Amino acid sequence: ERAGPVTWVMMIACVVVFIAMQILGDQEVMLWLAWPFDPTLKFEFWRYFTHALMHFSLMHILFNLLWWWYLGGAVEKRLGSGKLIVITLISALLSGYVQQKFSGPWFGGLSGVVYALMGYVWLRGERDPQSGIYLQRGLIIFALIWIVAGWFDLFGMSMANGAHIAGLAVGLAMAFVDSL
Ligand SMILES: *C(=O)C[C@@H](NC(=O)OC1CCCC1)c1ccccc1
Numbered sequence: 001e002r003a004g005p006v007t008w009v010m011m012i013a014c015v016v017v018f019i020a021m022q023i024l025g026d027q028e029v030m031l032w033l034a035w036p037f038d039p040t041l042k043f044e045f046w047r048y049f050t051h052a053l054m055h056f057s058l059m060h061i062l063f064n065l066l067w068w069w070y071l072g073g074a075v076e077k078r079l080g081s082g083k084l085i086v087i088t089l090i091s092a093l094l095s096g097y098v099q100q101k102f103s104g105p106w107f108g109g110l111s112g113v114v115y116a117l118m119g120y121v122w123l124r125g126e127r128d129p130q131s132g133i134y135l136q137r138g139l140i141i142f143a144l145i146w147i148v149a150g151w152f153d154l155f156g157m158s159m160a161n162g163a164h165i166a167g168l169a170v171g172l173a174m175a176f177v178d179s180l
Pocket residue numbers: 059060061063064067109110111112114115118142143146147150155157164
């Protein structure tokens with residue numbers, strides 16, 4: 001029993017980066033991995049994605065990776081690595097875009113991506129049971145509680161509601177496309 005290669009490599013990468021952040025401090029790692037925060041950086045193309053790899057607390061990374069492991073892992077197993085890769089790239093790009101637009105380039109984390117995955121697995125199951133992909137009732141509840149936590153700032157997070165929504169929109173859009 002094991003998480004697929006994308007699911008696994010993403011978790012490893014997040015952990016390595018989290019470690020780098022402990023050794024060097026958050027700021028220094030952000031200096032290299034954050035969304036372009038200066039026009040002289042706009043052509044360092046890894047930055048449009050690598051912001052998703054940074055986490056700022058234990059909770060952040062523990063919870064993001066837990067949801068990534070479960071939702072990302074299920075999508076990878078049942079729908080393929082390619083599917084997970086595309087959901088990840090698109091949600092990371094759009095949620096990052098929306099985030100920097102409203103609040104500037106200093107942010108990070110897999111939240112945009114897990115919102116997408118959450119939206120994807122849920123809607124897919126709603127519209128296409130026979131797909132084998134669905135979000136259990138109990139998990140819908142826990143997902144909702146964390147959405148509330150982020151919406152009303154019960155727990156301080158890196159990204160704002162807008163970027164979380166942008167992540168969700170991506171997942172819903174792809175599930176919708178997929179269930180035609
Ligand atoms: C990202 O939004 C950070 C939070 N993760 C999250 O809320 O994900 C839920 C689970 C399914 C999608 C919404 C977060 C949670 C706990 C601690 C810190 C950050």
